[PDB]
Amino acid sequence: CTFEYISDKHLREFVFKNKDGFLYVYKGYQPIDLPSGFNTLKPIFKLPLGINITNFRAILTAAYFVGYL
Amino acid sequence: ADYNYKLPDDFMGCVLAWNTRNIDYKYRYLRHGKLRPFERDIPLNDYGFGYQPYRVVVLSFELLNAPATVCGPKLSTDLIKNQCVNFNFNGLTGTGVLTPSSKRFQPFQQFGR
Amino acid sequence: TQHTSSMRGVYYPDEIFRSDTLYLTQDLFL
Ligand SMILES: *[C@@H]1O[C@H](CO)[C@@H](O)[C@H](O)[C@H]1NC(C)=O
Structure with missing residues (x-):
């Protein structure tokens, strides 16, 4: 283990980006099959973890949409 | 610089290195491609205890x-x-x-422009 | 299935206040 961090009818949207050994996360929320409109997202955190990310997977316990930047 | 530790071309910071022969490893030499800057991959070659080993510490600064x-x-x-x-x-x-x-201002903002 | 991203996925590019301008930026966007 090399990195650890612990912290304390609607649409939640996120942006994940990876560059220079940093992983940036942006988050936004909006209360409403993807609706048409405009919404803007604010940064939350960047992690200094130096790995290549070429795959990912969601974790479930009903729909989610994925697009590419 | 290819398969072990790459620095970006726009690096801002310091590199320090000193000789440690009084207390004296492995380095990768085969890979399918180079590394991106500040990437760590964790084909291996062992150093011979050839020149006396040096200790290197790199300091990187985030600019506000x-x-x-x-x-x-x-x-x-x-x-x-x-x-x-x-x-x-x-x-x-x-x-x-x-x-x-x-x-x-919003709480992530620090100055205007 | 496939849908369309009608003007979605805009974020604040940096930590700088700006007001009543038009700003051109080049980055990774949807
Ligand atoms: C990350 O993994 C992929 C495939 O496993 C590889 O092609 C790529 O070069 C790796 N990233 C880096 C920075 O080496």
Whole structure:
């Protein structure tokens, strides 16, 4: 283990980006099959973890949409 | 520089290295491609205890992308309004007059432009 | 299935206040 961090009818949207050994996360929320409109997202955190990310997977316990930047 | 440790071309920071032969490993040499800057992959070759091994520490500085935490030892003063002064906010220096503001920053924002 | 991203996925590019301008930026966007 090399990195650890612990912290304390609607649409939640996120942006994940990876560059220079940093992983940036942006988050936004909006209360409403993807609706048409405009919404803007604010940064939350960047992690200094130096790995290549070429795959990912969601974790479930009903729909989610994925697009590419 | 290819398969072990790459620095970006726009690097800002310091590199320090000293000789340690009094207390004296593995390095990758086969891979399918180079590494991106500050990437770590964890085909291996062992160093011969050829030249005496050196210890290297690299210091990288973030340039005020967040609220500042790592500053040098300096004494802060009270702030003067409505008067032409030299000012220094978190290492950002200048000359001007300061005024109370009606701009509405958001908590991740630090300065205007 | 496939849908369309009608003007979605805009974020604040940096930690700088800006007001009543038009700003051109080049980055990774949807
Ligand atoms: C990450 O993994 C992929 C495939 O496993 C590889 O092609 C890529 O070069 C790796 N990233 C880096 C920076 O080497």
